[PDB]
Design a protein around this ligand. Structure first.
Ligand SMILES: NC(=[NH2+])NCCC[C@@H](N)C(=O)O
Lengths: 149, 151
């Protein structure tokens, strides 16, 4: 699976527009799910999101993680991360997991995020819906991981 | 070269008490990571796709219009953390990222080219190397990732 991790002062997530999720300091994680992903692919993303040391702990750089500072996570599902753009300019999403299967996988991932950290600290979107996210990027600090490495 | 493209209704960049230096309305924010062994052909591929990827709908059609077609803007923000290696451990390390003194030369070259291949007034930038705060209204959201070393 693929993940783009961005570090935020906060994020406001809204749908067609009414705010339906919000977080202060922490991480927005765009989570694309490859169609051949295993529950081991999930665990790698979760371990990494919860544990990656992305904050300066005053005086020592790259030291504290989301759990350490008691920060929040917003997980947004982004199938467009499997938009192959090597052919034309029309991205093709043929590696992406099928929407239904994907929702079931996405959910489990969220359960586990809650099981691994804290369930008040994990926010979400409306899986396959138009969303509008005001993100305050801190740094900014972008982190990419394709677990197929 | 590594890039994360995000579709935006707008974007507001501020550097250090915060001061606003850059704004775009509708268009693309582009977190651009520059590999140690990047050549100019790597850069052109980045510049091309950002300008030419059809990330917007139009009438019937989906994935049909690119940033230029709509007279939209780009905000290009260098982001070495894209080469933050996370295979080993929970501390990121950036050994694969290019050296700051040259990255800066490469990034400007790139910015010029971004203007040359579109329009001078449609390309906003960050403040290379410096700490930045960026408000992004993500439209979709739509996230695209390209690693040129896959080509
Ligand atoms: N899908 C979504 N909610 N947001 C992204 C825009 C996708 C659009 N090309 C489409 O309508 O297919």
């Amino acid at each position: 699976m693929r993940v783009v991790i961005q570090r935020v002062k906060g994020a406001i997530l809204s749908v067609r527009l009414e705010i339906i999720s919000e977080i202060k300091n922490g991480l927005i994680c765009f989570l694309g799910i490859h169609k051949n992903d295993t529950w081991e692919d999930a665990l790698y993303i979760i371990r990494k999101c919860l544990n990656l040391r992305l904050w300066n702990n005053d005086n020592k750089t790259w030291d504290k993680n989301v759990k350490d500072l008691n920060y929040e996570l917003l997980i947004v599902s982004q199938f467009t991360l499997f938009g192959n753009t090597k052919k034309g300019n029309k991205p093709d999403f043929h590696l992406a997991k099928e929407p239904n299967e994907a929702l079931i996988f996405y959910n489990k991932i969220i359960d586990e995020f809650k099981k691994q950290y804290n369930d008040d600290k994990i926010k979400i979107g409306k899986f396959g819906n138009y969303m509008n996210i005001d993100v305050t990027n801190d740094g900014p600090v972008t982190i990419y991981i394709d677990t197929h490495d």
